[PDB]
Amino acid sequence: AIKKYKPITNGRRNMTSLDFAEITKTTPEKSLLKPLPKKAGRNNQGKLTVRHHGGGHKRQYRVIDFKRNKDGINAKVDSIQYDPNRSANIALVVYADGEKRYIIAPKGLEVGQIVESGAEADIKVGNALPLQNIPVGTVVHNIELKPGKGGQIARSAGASAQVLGKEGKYVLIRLRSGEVRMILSTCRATIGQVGNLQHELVNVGKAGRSRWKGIRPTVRGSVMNPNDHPHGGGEGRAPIGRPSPMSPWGKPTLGKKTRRGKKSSDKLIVRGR
Amino acid sequence: TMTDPIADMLTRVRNANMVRHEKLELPASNIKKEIAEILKSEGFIKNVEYVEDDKQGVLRLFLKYGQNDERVITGLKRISKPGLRVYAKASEMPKVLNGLGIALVSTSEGVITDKEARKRNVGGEIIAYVW
Amino acid sequence: RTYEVMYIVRPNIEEDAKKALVERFNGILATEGAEVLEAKDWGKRRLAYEINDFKDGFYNIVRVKSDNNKATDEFQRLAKISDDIIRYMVIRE
Amino acid sequence: KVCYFTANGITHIDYKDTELLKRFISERGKILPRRVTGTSAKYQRMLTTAIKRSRHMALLPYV
Amino acid sequence: ISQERKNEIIKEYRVHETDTGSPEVQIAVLTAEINAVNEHLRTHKKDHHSRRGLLKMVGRRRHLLNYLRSKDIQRYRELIKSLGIR
Amino acid sequence: KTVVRKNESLEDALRRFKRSVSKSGTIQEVRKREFYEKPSVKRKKKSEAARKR
RNA sequence: AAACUUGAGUGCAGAAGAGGAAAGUGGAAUUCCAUGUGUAGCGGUGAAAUGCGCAGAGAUAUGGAGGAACACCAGUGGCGAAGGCGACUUUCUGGUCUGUAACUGACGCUGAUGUGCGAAAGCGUGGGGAUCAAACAGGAUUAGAUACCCUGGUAGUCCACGCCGUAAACGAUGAGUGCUAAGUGUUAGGGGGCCCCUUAGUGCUGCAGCUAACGCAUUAAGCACUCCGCCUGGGGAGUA
RNA sequence: AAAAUGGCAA
Ligand SMILES: [Mg+2]
Ligand SMILES: [Mg+2]
Ligand SMILES: [Mg+2]
Ligand SMILES: [Mg+2]
Ligand SMILES: [Mg+2]
Ligand SMILES: [Mg+2]
Ligand SMILES: [Mg+2]
Ligand SMILES: [Mg+2]
Ligand SMILES: [Mg+2]
Ligand SMILES: [Mg+2]
């Protein structure tokens, strides 16, 4: 699924790309498109709050059904499409009633396949059930943390989670991180794994392509001045010269845990990543 | 696969003669019959019998053994081989064991002993030596 | 081709529930281009070793003749999903 | 000895036929050697496939 | 191939009735067999042992085709066009 | 499981137990798998054992 | 040029198999983790110590997780060109052998160059990681110990897809074919009365013959024919 | 358990 470019130029040298064979339709659905202006890591105050975000190709936001709450009505997959806003591909699925929606395209989803959601749904890829209904040992994705909110976990390309066990109201799941956590059985998850598995393997190849994706350059703290970074200053190249590597904002950045204490999720989490 | 029928005939006789078998049966061909008849004529083999098997026929050669279980045929050698064919002119016709042995030769006249070939002044392919 | 299928149902299952299960699965066995030649319930038997913390189980044997293995594969998928069927095996011969 | 299967003229061993299989398994549940049983080579192979299938279905004990 | 399928093939390509040994008959069965293994090899590309069997059939078919060409040019040309092998 | 017979010596029952263990050959199996041997070696030893029998 | 069926194929009736590929399903054990019980060691060796444990180890009971390998059966047993192939199930799929004599009618054999396959280690990418374990680290041993032994332990060992292309890759025995005493065991058949006969394997024993000798001996290293590969003192050197 | 080595000719 990866296309390896020949070394015609030094820029193209070592550059690889996805074949995009899976994509069936190259045009988005007009009805499910909404505008998505770029923020470039700038908040309401207008100041830069997250660095290295800016520019990039314009993108229209595609509306997606993470909830998968339409139950008892079968949907046929019209197309698999490229979404600029996510690593995964999206599937235009037309319900029997005639509603057209986008969903995160599961791996092995095909045009003309039927997908259903609900407790009574069969355990086949593209089907969204409450976790309780889903059997143990099943790979699942688009998992809702809160019931009815919509799936928030395992939405990325080549992402899945495995149902491990049932514990009363909660169900135990192992996340891709390796975390084992309890989720309410009422919460839903789609059967299967997200596709576009080869997304990670892509070699961007050149600086300009990173700029197309809206990533602005990263300057190291070592090559800054003392006023700019804790790592700044020094004559010539310098070693860290401190007990640990530090963030730009003067916080230790290697090994130092940052998860907030006294969180309700701590009881839900059984095993860390 | 079998590549030389004649060589097999000579070898069968040799193998049988070693174990002093009275008779041997072999697949029959016209050339092999002619060789057999010559051997009987020279007294190397006692008798030859031919039968029709509805395929190519079967030859039965009766080996001759002297008193004290002596063997009349000391040895057989295939002079001309499928890999390399040996042809000799009448002047160059070989003598086996200083004339004590016989050399089977295929000639325009027919398959004959070396002595006959020299007599008629007709050269031929040297099939084998028997002594 | 003729296939013989044996499925063990959990001992704690209700008699009404067991009847619904056997009926469903026997349908699955004859779903696609298949005829059930016979279906026989061995009934509750002591398991030689404990399976899913059950020392006993209901054995059901079904014989199915089909040109394709689609029905048997369908049975196997649903049997794996089903909590009731603790053990199942499909044998051609 | 003599092969039971040959003597009784039975050409098929069934995993469902527990009682037949039980004779040729040890008290530990180990498959008995063909020499001790006196079974023929062909039938010893059939017996093992039958024993292993029955063990899967919990008709016969592994141990 | 299935015996039924083979039996259909022999009847189509038989020179005379009750003929199973004709070069045409043998070639046709081999051709059908060759295609069948190829389809298996497409699904299963790591079945090296099966491919060896295919290679033998290919060689046998070639040898029979060579013999037929020597024996009869017309029949050979008819067989290759009929089986679509060339 | 060997069970000590009623009005039987413990040593006698232990003897019976020892015989039962010998029949099982469990100890023998444990000793074989104490140390790893190369797969070829296993076959050779098995063949040698067959030749011994 | 025309015939023939013995070779070589094909049909038909049978047989056996850890042959191959892809999924699915078991059970034993190991390791780790969580609790209950319980207590001053456990572990290891020639002997030790490192190590682990008293922050409750080890052991015992129960539960969970995960990977890998399939006890018994098991056999000079089976299958495969070789390398190899051992839980069970299904799907796909190759080869072989017996019998018969439908058919074809020498259509065969070998095989330079080619073209594939090819243990283990290794290499690349992605994944996985129980056990074992190069390297590495303690302990011990020793004159020294960059070892042997002990406690750990990384790659690797596992999967997929590429690459590598070698092994005492061995029967140190190229392939095809025919012939030449017997005795005996076993695997898959066939035929006729437990016995006999016969076919294809797989062992043991042993003539004739062969061999420098050891040995080989119908599974030739005997006796023959075809074809291919290979050798011609040792070292330098499988090096430049 | 440890347990090394012994001028070349005659
Ligand atoms: Mg950044
Ligand atoms: Mg500066
Ligand atoms: Mg500062
Ligand atoms: Mg500094
Ligand atoms: Mg400096
Ligand atoms: Mg390797
Ligand atoms: Mg070690
Ligand atoms: Mg070499
Ligand atoms: Mg034999
Ligand atoms: Mg000296």
**Protein residue with the closest CA to the C1' atom of nucleotide G117:** E48
Backbone torsions φ then ψ of C50, nearest 5 degrees = -70, 130
Alpha-carbon distance of C78 to D2, in angstroms, equals 45
Interface of C with D (CB under 8 A): 6, 8, 47-49, 51, 57, 59, 61, 87, 89, 91
Q: Cα distance from A133 to chain C (closest Cα, Å)?
A: 10
Residues B46/B64, Cβ–Cβ less than 8 Å: yes
Please tell me whether residue C2 adopts helix, strand or coil conformation: strand
Number of domains forming the structure of chain D: 1
Alpha-carbon distance of D33 to E57, in angstroms, equals 42
* Tokens 């000590």 sit on residue: F4
Total Cβ atoms within 10 A of residue A42: 14
Helix axes C15-29, C70-81, angle to 10 degrees: 150
E strand residue ranges, chain B? 23-27, 45-51, 58-63, 65-66, 70-71, 76-78, 87-88, 102-107, 111-113, 124-130
Task: Check CB contact of A108 with chain C, cutoff 8 Å.
Answer: no
**Domain range holding D3?**
1-63
Alpha-carbon distance of A117 to A129, in angstroms, equals 6
**CA A52 to centroid of ligand 4, rounded, Å:** 23
Task: Check CB contact of A165 with chain C, cutoff 8 Å.
Answer: no
Residues of C in contact with D56 (CB under 8 A): 87, 89
Q: Cα distance from C72 to chain A (closest Cα, Å)?
A: 17
Task: Check CB contact of D56 with chain C, cutoff 8 Å.
Answer: yes
DSSP string for residues in chain D: ---HHHHTT-----SS-HHHHHHTB-TTSPBPPHHHHT--HHHHHHHHHHHHHHHHTTSS---
Which residue in chain A has the smallest CA separation from C77?
A123
CA–C1' span, A198 to G126, in Å? 9
Task: Check CB contact of D14 with chain C, cutoff 8 Å.
Answer: no
* Neighbouring subunits of C (3+ Cβ pairs under 8 A): A, D
* Neighbouring subunits of A (3+ Cβ pairs under 8 A): C
Residues 6+ apart with CB under 8 A from A224: A231, A232
**CA F43 to centroid of ligand 7, rounded, Å:** 25
Residues F2/F24, Cβ–Cβ less than 8 Å: no
Nucleotide nearest to A176 (CA to C1'): G127
* CB nearest to D58's CB, from C51, C61, C91: C51
Rg for chain C, CA atoms, rounded: 13
Q: Would you state the structure tokens that stand for residue A191, as one six-digit string?
A: 């059967």
**Domain range holding C51?**
3-92
Please tell me whether residue A33 adopts helix, strand or coil conformation: strand
Q: What DSSP designation does E21 have?
A: -
Would the CA dihedral through F24, F25, F31, F34 be positive or negative?
Answer: negative
Number of domains forming the structure of chain C: 1
Determine if residue D36 is left, alpha or beta; phi over 0 gives left, psi from -120 to 50 gives alpha, anything else beta: alpha
Q: Given an 8 Å threshold on Cβ–Cβ distance, is C87 in contact with D60?
A: no
**CA E67 to centroid of ligand 10, rounded, Å:** 76
Residues 6+ apart with CB under 8 A from A180: A164, A172, A173, A174, A269, A270, A271
Alpha-carbon distance of A199 to A82, in angstroms, equals 12
Residues of D in contact with C59 (CB under 8 A): 57
Residues of C in contact with A135 (CB under 8 A): 80-81
**How far is residue A130 from each of residues A67, A95, A120, A199, C85, measured CA to CA in Å?**
11, 20, 10, 29, 22
Residues A147/A131, Cβ–Cβ less than 8 Å: no
Alpha-carbon distance of A259 to A194, in angstroms, equals 27
Amino acid of residue A162: Q
Alpha-carbon distance of B94 to B74, in angstroms, equals 18
Residues D37/D1, Cβ–Cβ less than 8 Å: yes
Helix H or strand E segment including E60? helix E48-71
Terminal-to-terminal C-alpha distance of chain A: 30
Give the CA-trace dihedral at D46, D52, D55, D60, to 10 degrees.
40
* Neighbouring subunits of E (3+ Cβ pairs under 8 A): none
Residues 6+ apart with CB under 8 A from A256: A244
Q: Given an 8 Å threshold on Cβ–Cβ distance, is C49 in contact with D62?
A: yes
Candidate CATH numbers 3.50.50.60, 3.40.50.300, 4.10.950.10, 3.30.420.40; the one for domain A195-270: 4.10.950.10
Which of the nucleotides in strand G have any atom less than 7 Å away from a protein CB atom? Answer: 4-13, 16-22, 24-28, 63-66, 71-77, 80-83, 87-95, 102-109, 116-118, 125-126, 132, 161-162, 176-181, 186-189, 194, 208-209, 222-227
Residues B130/B76, Cβ–Cβ less than 8 Å: yes
Q: How many residues does chain F have?
A: 53
Please tell me whether residue A84 adopts helix, strand or coil conformation: coil
Q: Given an 8 Å threshold on Cβ–Cβ distance, is D58 in contact with C61?
A: no
Please tell me whether residue A10 adopts helix, strand or coil conformation: coil
Q: C interface mutation test: which of A123, A125, A139, A163 has the most C CBs within 10 A? A: A123
**How far is residue E84 from each of residues E5, E31, E64, measured CA to CA in Å?**
18, 9, 15
**CA D11 to centroid of ligand 9, rounded, Å:** 28
Alpha-carbon distance of A91 to F18, in angstroms, equals 69
Alpha-carbon distance of D15 to C86, in angstroms, equals 19
Domain spanning A2-113: CATH 2.40.50.140: yes
Q: Would you state the structure tokens that stand for residue B33, as one six-digit string?
A: 């019959």
Q: Given an 8 Å threshold on Cβ–Cβ distance, is C89 in contact with D55?
A: no
Q: Please choose, from the candidates B6, B79, B16, B7, the residue with its C-alpha nearest in 3D space to the C-alpha of residue B45.
A: B16
Helix axes E23-43, E73-83, angle to 10 degrees: 30
Nucleotide nearest to E16 (CA to C1'): G103
**CA D38 to centroid of ligand 7, rounded, Å:** 46
Nucleotide nearest to D57 (CA to C1'): G26
